[PDB]
Design a binder for this molecule. Structure first.
Ligand SMILES: [Ca+2]
Ligand SMILES: [Ca+2]
Ligand SMILES: [Mn+2]
Ligand SMILES: [Mn+2]
Ligand SMILES: [Mn+2]
Ligand SMILES: [Mn+2]
Ligand code: NA
Ligand code: NA
Lengths: 299, 319, 293, 320
């Protein structure tokens, strides 16, 4: 059962299990049993973005007709992640992004706002919205709000990027501990990526991977290159994708990791639970909006 | 000494295969990427060695699947959809789009060249310096390949060497005199026209007239259009592998989308593709013979590596 | 915008569809999330469309769906409400006892009088717009009618008094706006702008009333004040809750300002939205059903 | 004498069109309501004569616009959303919803039938008397149609007349003695099952087995599922035109939302839809051929008029 009628923001559609082709100058979508039931109703304007996921194919004639119409096209894994390969976006956000990015102070302004955005999404999904709680995420509501409020303040006071990052890490650590307790996980230590074998560290690694796919889709639709991070160091590959994934990491991935663990989920149960959370909470939209908002303010 | 990344870049720069496909389906078969043609009853199946491939050009009557895209992206192979007969995929306003490129998005790129690039790119006079630098590099390749390339000589490129030296020397003087981008573009077309003429005479083509937008029917024009796709693919690869978006053109930005691909393809279009278009015409090659001959020359001359070095030099020389 | 408590949403200029497993609504490039639960109601207005796959998902999730004009009126067509937290049994439970029906009717009249007092006097929006009504004459009128309504012994007398209050509000409204002589023209037969705007305004009010009865599952044919044989009777009863408080002054204001049809229309819609008219209609209907037992 | 409103009801009862639409958009084009399919190079545009239409059923791959809803609603045309391939739009627990109906809300209905209806409806025993009444009206349509409709006979419905007459007599008997709604429901399904068998034999279908929830792939089952939508549409129209809410069911209330639609559709399902489903299977009709043949039968037999009279009769009899 659906529970949300989604006010769509970014004009991005996901397709799966169909063949995209052209009949008489018209882009159509075909399955083994004739015309696809939904896809004919995706609007083919220069504001559209198309992601072709599981069991899709496309012909050259369709590609022509989509590119002619200003439709950006990409290929993604199941559920829109990872983002495999995509059309380059014509160079708008890039100009603005570059406009502030070389001013280290404006970069910190961007980084501070990302953290505020991230703090709010934690507050929202762990407390205000009930779904996680309903599914057994029994977090100490009181200790959570303290954590957010302390960190928020501690973040506001960091004088520079190095300090912001330190505080940013401390908050994540605090959340792991609360999440573990919430779910009676017992001892938890975050293992640096790939190196932990326990279910939670695993689900966290896999979850972050699904989120990087959504973040990459956000930077791609906006024409913003991965190498212009606001929080991660300037030499980190994929740096901005990670900044962008960090927006919903602790609010959506973190709690489902400990839940799947608590519940004895296998890898695919976790992946699917995760995608459903990202979907319901409109994560991709938020990543996009955060990016626009930051660019808009910069100058 | 060298990073593992830089090693991988060198290794990528040595991939020799570049496919141009028509009337086939690109898909995955027993975990291999393959293209499939319909031979009436037969279907023929052709392997694609992805670790050795820089790009796929997919023209008329092609399709590709998401599972192939997955495998291709993961191996860092670009996929471009192009039009038929060397004509544009489509034309919108006054701009022709030869290839729609799909570039891998999850194989994270280095950041340093991108940062240098967006560092100069919004400054018009610094784009001028970058444009000029590409043009200089282009002239040095024309000289080397037209004058010191025994392999081209031995294949029947009986070019008037004195005349080639004179045109290239005049172009250099003009290039360095150019006040702006319009002057660069003007000089470039002017060299190209002299070179087509010289190549025509070298190969007994008879009187040659360059036809635009893939409109020419004659062997030379067709081979020149087909060969440019090869240069576009290497250029699309060279910029992708360094993390530079195709859109940040410094010379062709007014008349081409993803114009950096054209800027970079110009490094080898006149030096390498052009002679071989006339050599193939002269000998009666079919298109795919000509394509193989180019790939051989581009591998031999280490074209991809040159393109990548030049991008680096251009990026470094705005610091 | 979808303004009306956690439960009724209004959409316009968008396509409702299913993509990537979600029910989504896609706004026109020219122009908040909605919860899909069994308590949701959804109205699709100007420049909307919906696919069968979306309808499926909303129906499955217990969302009642309707189509309506600009701003939520008229109500064109809607899902049948499941007969049951159900007002229908209660409604019918009192409706056949004529004395209980009068109790309902008396409550509607008190509710309507309070709305008039609120909007004409207490609340100043109307005032600010140039509705310069004699505050004193208005309070006398309301108090007198209230008293006269409580004194009426049956529906007939209640209806008589009810019309006599409307007549005296028209006159107060005309003077408030320096309109000059006014006489209510019955049945769309009036040509002067106040008469025309009152006709149009009531039509917009019917649209809202129809929505209120639809959400509660109550049939139009069970009126508490209008005659048993009158088609759309309960809708007219419900519209009467806000006719004189909101539509009547806007009609004289629009005429005074030289408004065209659409100015008037948009002014009502805004008044109706500002004053939360639809919620009042619904609350009143719920309360009458509650106080009927 | 005859009121303009009742004349309008008689006029509405004669509307002959009923559309079942798939893979198209319903919209307004030059002031007309039309449906549009995409045919590669050319879109096809099909007019909907709204004054001559009872309902639209919109299945797989449809959409409709507010502007179309406005024109349809104004003309008193119902719009239902149905599922694919004769299967339910959806199922929520033990209850299947075949069609989600949108009914016009600004074309004010008469009040008298509704008032009679809510007057008896909350009394179970009165609902029972209403259910029996519907069931007798159904037996009478079955008799008239299977025994006296020469048109069906000439189309090759070679039914065993005596076998049919005997089953309907047994049914009437069992009907009158039904103590509960439970008993009525049991007898209803027992008669329908005899009728499938008789229709199958009249049309050389071979052994027939009714499949539920649209799950049957054989022609008869598919036409039965398809024909039911037509009956639902006319029932939805009959009840709406009289101002009776779909939910005030007297028979199928336990298993069906908007159950009165089913109770009313039962007046013509076995009498008309059922033989035609077997005739179409016998001839090799495509689905749209079958649907047209039904519409022709329903119009010739004045099915909508009968449903409407029956609801009126039932409402008027509750009143004693
Ligand atoms: Ca090198
Ligand atoms: Ca009759
Ligand atoms: Mn980090
Ligand atoms: Mn050039
Ligand atoms: Mn009245
Ligand atoms: Mn039945
Ligand atoms: Na050509
Ligand atoms: Na079926």
């Amino acid at each position: 059962l659906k529970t949300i009628l989604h006010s769509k923001r970014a004009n991005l559609y996901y397709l799966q299990h169909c063949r995209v082709l052209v009949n008489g100058g018209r882009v159509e979508y075909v399955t083994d049993e004739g015309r696809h039931s939904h896809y004919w109703n995706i609007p083919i304007a220069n504001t559209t973005s198309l992601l072709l996921g599981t069991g899709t194919s496309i012909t050259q004639a369709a590609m022509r007709e989509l590119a002619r119409a200003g439709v950006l096209v990409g290929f993604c894994g199941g559920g829109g992640t990872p983002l495999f390969s995509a059309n380059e976006v014509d160079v708008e956000y890039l100009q603005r992004w570059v406009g502030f990015w070389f001013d280290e102070e404006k970069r910190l302004v961007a980084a501070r706002h990302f953290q505020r955005a991230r703090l709010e999404r934690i507050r929202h999904s762990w407390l205000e919205d009930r779904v996680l709680r309903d599914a057994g995420f029994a977090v100490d509501a009181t200790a959570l709000a303290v954590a957010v409020e302390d960190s928020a303040r501690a973040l506001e006071q960091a004088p520079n990027h190095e300090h912001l990052l330190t505080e940013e890490a401390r908050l994540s650590k605090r959340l792991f501990k609360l999440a573990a307790q919430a779910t009676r996980y017992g001892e938890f230590v975050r293992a640096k990526r790939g190196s932990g074998g326990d279910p939670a560290n695993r689900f966290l690694d896999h979850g972050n991977y699904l989120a990087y796919g959504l973040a990459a889709t956000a930077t791609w639709v906006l024409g913003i290159p991965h190498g212009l991070a606001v929080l991660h160091g300037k030499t980190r590959r994929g740096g901005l994708v990670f900044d962008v994934a960090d927006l919903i990491k602790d609010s959506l991935i973190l709690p489902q990791a400990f839940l799947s663990a608590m519940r004895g989920d296998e890898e695919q149960d976790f992946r699917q639970a995760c995608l459903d959370n990202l979907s319901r909470a409109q994560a991709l939209d938020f990543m996009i909006d955060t990016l626009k908002d930051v660019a808009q303010r910069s100058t």
